[PDB]
Design a protein around this ligand. Structure first.
Ligand SMILES: [Mg+2]
Ligand SMILES: [Mg+2]
Ligand SMILES: [Mg+2]
Ligand SMILES: [Mg+2]
Ligand SMILES: [Mg+2]
Ligand SMILES: [Mg+2]
Ligand SMILES: [Mg+2]
Ligand SMILES: [Mg+2]
Ligand SMILES: [Mg+2]
Ligand SMILES: [Mg+2]
Ligand SMILES: [Mg+2]
Ligand SMILES: [Mg+2]
Ligand SMILES: [Mg+2]
Lengths: 106, 197, 172, 136, 190
RNA sequence: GUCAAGCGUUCAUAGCGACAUUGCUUUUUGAUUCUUCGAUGUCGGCUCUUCCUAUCAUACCGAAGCAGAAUUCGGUAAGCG
RNA sequence: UUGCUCCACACAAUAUAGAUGGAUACGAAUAAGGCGUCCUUGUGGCGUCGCUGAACCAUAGCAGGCUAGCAACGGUGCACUUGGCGGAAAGGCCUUGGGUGCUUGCUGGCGAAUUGCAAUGUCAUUUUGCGUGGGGAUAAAUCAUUUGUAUACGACUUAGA
């Protein structure tokens, strides 16, 4: 149709942090439409892609992807913690990531 | 969810709105706030006027052009409140502030777009009835802002044309809704009602 | 203190060879758990008798429920407390369906109105006012008129979405 | 020369007021107010819908526009007798409010194949409607 | 304490029409009309039987109950002022210099000019508010009569004439000079 | 600043106020040797700017044991000398 | 040493504070309103709605192919056009008419595979450049000279085919 979305839109918000020390190995993601840790248990283990563009073409593409996955939930309001194979570059604070429905259970 | 979110600032409390907008900007949402002359601050007008005069009285002594810049327009009071809620000296907080536009009244393009409200910041939802509040338009014209009567002339013009729009829009939604009720009692429309639609 | 519970605690003052079978003192204790209720037992008997926990014995702690927890009762609560500059007696009236849920309100009310903590307050007596017109306080005599009904103006509905599209209303 | 003072209507916290629990183990069940404890807290009883007789704040509670005759302090057996004799559950289910609760339960319960059917039927109804708009 | 319900009565007499949309009160009678915007209060008006309007506060503290009898008194002032009207009488008090007050027009604004107060060459000027009708008493020496519908407008205009004639830099226990209100009454009173 | 025995023709408090009592200042004068001995140029003056208000004058007021004139007590006030 | 600009389509480089169905327009009140409707046109009567956008619109087709009809005269896209309105930052909103596709409103026929069990699996929008073929346009400033209403030097202010 006009839409081909097979992922759920998210936002790369922050690293895991205290007041004055951040942890780049964990990133906090706001899944759209999730407002509860009990709602957010559906998405645990789902693969996150951060899809971004470049100028050098490497393997027949100017689009590069960073792959990761939801690991657990964060807080009371549906934020989840995610880990990526290479950590998200921190200029993407506020950028949109893609939360795919696989590995699916229901 | 929208690419930009357009907030009607009328009847909102200024710091409850500015904390909502500041979190939204740093989350990557673009926000334009209109009608910043009809923002509200809790407390009596005199109460809030002394607060500006205490802010007005601080400036760099050896060069008054280096000090705090006491911006007088209601959109800039709200921009000041939203600054200090954003790490505005870092590149991330500069980029967050680029995601924000603030206006007095409802200028173009936004005069023909949908305006949202923030019920976490709404005055009639958050303040106790019987309290006293100030409107940011009346505060700003007492601290040195020059365009209250111009915006009130432009908004009154804006509401005349916008009422003609909605008067046509009511007439079309008579024609539509009376057709949908007449297209009810159809075997499709009994079958859509089974599916909850 | 999620909910107070009323306990009976019975204590003894340990038997001696001169005195077997001592005299079995009982209190009614409002407390969160049984640990506090036994601690509140010894704290109160040490104000009344030559006995302490090192020379005494808890012989029964039983939780007392409310007999009719779904009946609205006017209570009269007698309370003694320490202020910042003295000790005062006090009588307050709480309308509620449980004794342990009136004692919740009283500890909430004395903290809110007199800044009195849990450690300052002694509950002298909770009794249910049996008959109307023996109700003294006017703030509870409000809710005892024939065919009472009241509106709730200015309804504020909570939202789960950060944005609304309607400029909401407070009718109710 | 008629004095015209605006109505200023309000659902009253009263004995016999039918309410809707919005938070808790009920969360969507009807109940009737039995006695008024104080200004924020009432005693309710929901015996037909299996709500325990309980003292509840009005913050877990929405007032509804339904009221039936009920003596003050009436017990759980008495409430259920007056509930059925006044037929609250069919008075409530006829309302637009209960229909919208029932519709959003239905919409959430639709399967993916049923969602396809809603798409197919809506384009049929839209074809009939948009034709009818141009003709009149 | 937050009283459950405090409530007041307003007697609308036989000729008066009272109309209350949101909190804006319109009182119409044999003498004109009056309007008040009571939207700063949060009371609730309700009409009982066309000769009576209740006004109520639900769950009101001490100050909120306090404003309820104010709102009763203000609407009753509006009802009195459109049925019987309001009338104030002020006398001139002077020791030596007589006080010359004549009703004057300056650019269609209808002022009150006061010459020779304590021998001042300064002409004092009080504008007449709308509705207030200034009259000068015959068979009373040196009396000005202010008449109108609003007790708010009539008394403040009578306040303004007293306030402009204050005595400066003198002992006011002896220099008892000025125009003072002598009578607060109705127009169609007997 | 509280209290008020008294002063103020009678009258505690217009203006005062004992015996007590509670605070404020760091510009007076006293206590640490905290910093400075591989040196922070030591008083006064002149010049020049700014700030405070615990206000002398000026603006507007309230009180008097304020008739007037002149005073005295007090308020807002550092805009301007 | 055919330079400049605009329009369209052809290719390179450039990047992206971060497209991935739709930013979907009354105003006012909140101790009150919205919508429908009726009349005497009101601060009116009656009905009805809220209790969140959990909406509404859109939405099926090799990322959406090729093709056959039925029904209706509707919907939608592109390009021309007609008229009106919009100056707060208008740069958009509403219209008239023809052409041109598409139509899943309904019923058919053919295609798809091997990307091998998943790899964003590339579909957006900026800046530029080079190329094509179509239009348009045909200057200034600065130095150097000069003035002194100016000036430490620059700067200013004047004058010169
Ligand atoms: Mg962060
Ligand atoms: Mg963290
Ligand atoms: Mg809008
Ligand atoms: Mg200026
Ligand atoms: Mg004076
Ligand atoms: Mg004098
Ligand atoms: Mg040294
Ligand atoms: Mg001062
Ligand atoms: Mg002075
Ligand atoms: Mg002074
Ligand atoms: Mg100053
Ligand atoms: Mg100065
Ligand atoms: Mg289609």
């Amino acid at each position: 149709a006009e839409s081909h979305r097979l992922y759920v839109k998210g936002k790369h918000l922050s690293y895991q942090r205290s007041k004055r020390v951040n942890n780049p190995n964990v990133s906090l993601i706001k899944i759209e439409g999730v407002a509860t840790p009990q709602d957010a248990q559906f998405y645990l283990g789902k693969r996150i892609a951060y899809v971004y563009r470049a100028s050098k073409e490497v393997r027949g593409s100017k689009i590069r992807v960073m792959w990761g996955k939801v690991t657990r939930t964060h807080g009371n309001s549906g934020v989840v913690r995610a880990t990526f194979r290479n950590n998200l570059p921190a200029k993407t604070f506020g950028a949109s990531v893609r939360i795919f429905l696989y590995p699916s259970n229901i | 969810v929208e690419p930009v979110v357009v907030i009607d600032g009328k009847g909102h409390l200024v710091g409850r709105l500015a904390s909502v907008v500041a979190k939204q900007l740093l989350n990557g949402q673009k926000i334009v706030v209109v009608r910043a002359e009809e923002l509200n601050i809790s407390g009596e007008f005199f109460r809030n006027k002394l607060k500006y005069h205490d802010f007005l009285r601080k400036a760099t002594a050896f060069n008054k052009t280096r000090g705090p810049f006491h911006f007088r327009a209601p959109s800039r009071i709200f921009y000041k409140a939203l600054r200090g809620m954003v790490s505005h000296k870092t590149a991330r907080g500069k980029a967050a502030l680029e995601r924000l536009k603030v206006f007095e009244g409802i200028p173009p393009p936004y005069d023909k777009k949908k305006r949202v409200v923030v019920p976490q910041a709404l005055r009639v939802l958050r303040l106790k009835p019987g309290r006293k509040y100030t409107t940011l338009g009346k505060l700003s014209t007492s601290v040195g802002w020059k365009y209250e009567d111009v915006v009130a002339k432009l908004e009154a013009k804006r509401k005349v044309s916008s009422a003609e729009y909605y008067a046509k829009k009511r007439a079309f939604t008579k024609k539509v809704a009376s057709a949908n009720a007449t297209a009810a009692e159809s075997d499709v429309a009994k079958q859509l009602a089974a599916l909850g639609y | 203190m999620a909910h107070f519970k009323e306990y009976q605690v019975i204590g003894r003052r340990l038997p001696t060879e001169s005195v077997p079978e001592p005299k079995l003192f009982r209190m009614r204790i409002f407390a969160s758990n049984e640990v506090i209720a036994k601690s509140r037992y010894w704290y109160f008997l040490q104000k009344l008798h030559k006995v302490k926990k090192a020379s005494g014995e808890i012989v029964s702690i039983n939780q007392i429920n409310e007999a009719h927890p779904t009946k609205v009762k006017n209570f009269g609560v007698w309370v003694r407390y320490d202020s910042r500059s003295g000790t005062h007696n006090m009588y307050k009236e709480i309308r509620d369906v449980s004794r342990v849920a009136a004692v919740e309100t009283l500890y909430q009310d004395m903290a809110a109105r007199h800044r009195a903590r849990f450690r300052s307050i002694h509950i002298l007596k909770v009794a249910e006012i049996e008959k109307t017109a023996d109700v003294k306080r006017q703030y509870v005599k409000q809710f005892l008129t024939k065919d009472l009904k009241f509106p709730l103006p200015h309804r504020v509905q909570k939202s789960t979405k950060t944005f609304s599209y309607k400029r909401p209303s407070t009718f109710y | 020369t008629d004095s015209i003072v605006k109505a200023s209507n309000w659902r009253l916290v009263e004995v016999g007021r039918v309410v809707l629990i919005k938070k808790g183990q009920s969360a969507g069940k009807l109940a009737a107010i039995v006695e008024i404890i104080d200004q924020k807290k009432v005693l309710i009883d929901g015996p037909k819908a299996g709500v325990p007789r309980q003292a509840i704040n009005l913050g877990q509670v929405v007032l509804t526009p339904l009221t039936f005759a009920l003596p003050r302090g009436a017990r759980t057996a008495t409430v259920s007798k007056k509930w059925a004799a006044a037929a609250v559950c069919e008075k409530w289910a006829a309302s637009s409010w209960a229909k919208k609760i029932a519709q959003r339960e239905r919409r959430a319960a639709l399967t993916d194949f049923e969602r396809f059917q809603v798409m197919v039927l809506r384009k049929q109804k839209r074809y009939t409607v948009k034709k009818a708009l141009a003709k009149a | 304490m937050k009283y459950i319900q405090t409530e007041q009565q307003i007697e609308v007499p036989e000729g008066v029409t009272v109309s209350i949309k949101s909190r804006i009160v319109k009182v119409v009678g044999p003498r004109g009309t009056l309007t008040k915007n009571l939207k700063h209060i949060d009371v609730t008006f309700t009409k009982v039987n066309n000769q009576l309007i209740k006004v109520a506060v639900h769950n009101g503290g001490r100050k909120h109950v306090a404003a309820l009898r104010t709102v009763k008194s203000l609407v009753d002032n509006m009802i009195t002022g459109v049925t019987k009207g309001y009338k104030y009488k002020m006398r001139y008090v002077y020791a030596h210099f007589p006080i010359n007050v004549n009703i004057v027009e300056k650019d269609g604004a209808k002022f009150i000019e006061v010459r020779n107060f304590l021998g001042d060459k300064k002409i004092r000027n009080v504008p007449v508010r709308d509705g207030v009708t200034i009259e000068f008493s015959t068979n009373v020496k040196d009396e000005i009569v202010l008449s109108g519908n609003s007790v708010e407008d009539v008394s403040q205009n009578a306040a303004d004439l007293q306030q402009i004639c204050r005595v400066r830099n003198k002992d006011i226990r002896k220099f008892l000079d000025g125009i003072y209100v002598s009578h607060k009454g109705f127009i169609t009173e007997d």
